Design a protein around this ligand. Sequence first.
Ligand SMILES: *[C@@H]1O[C@H](CO)[C@@H](O)[C@H](O)[C@H]1NC(C)=O
Lengths: 49, 49, 48
Amino acid sequence: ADSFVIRGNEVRQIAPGQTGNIADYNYKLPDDFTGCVIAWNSNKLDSKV
Amino acid sequence: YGFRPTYGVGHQPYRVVVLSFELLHAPATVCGPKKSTNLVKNKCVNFNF
Amino acid sequence: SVYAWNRKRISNCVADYSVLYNFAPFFTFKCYGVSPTKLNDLCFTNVY
Ligand SMILES: *[C@@H]1O[C@H](CO)[C@@H](O)[C@H](O)[C@H]1NC(C)=O
């Protein structure tokens, strides 16, 4: 289980085919991969002042 | 990043946890719920190893 | 308006599709064709 925070535009870009600022320079998921990811909203509980 | 709890919606964060499973390899450690049954050794069965 | 849309021509310019996520985030991008990350790989004769 690997947990982190990433805003709103790469939740579906964490797929193996998609690449960019996150897959090349952050958490990279391999071309073949078995497993499931889980994400939820953080509109106020992880937004702060 | 960083903002007040109301912002331009697209920057609102997300908490992502992955679950990268793996199979084959060593004897298993994670198993899930068990319904284990005693053994027979000379007849056909519907086994689950 | 949805009945009279503007058909803007984009030509003769370098298109960096990486820096798009700041102008209007929370999109879908629904790429019926070229992949989301593959725009910055090939040339386009006309973009509208
Ligand atoms: C749109 O233009 C305004 C200035 O009129 C600017 O303040 C704003 O940041 C621009 N929005 C973009 C580039 O997403």
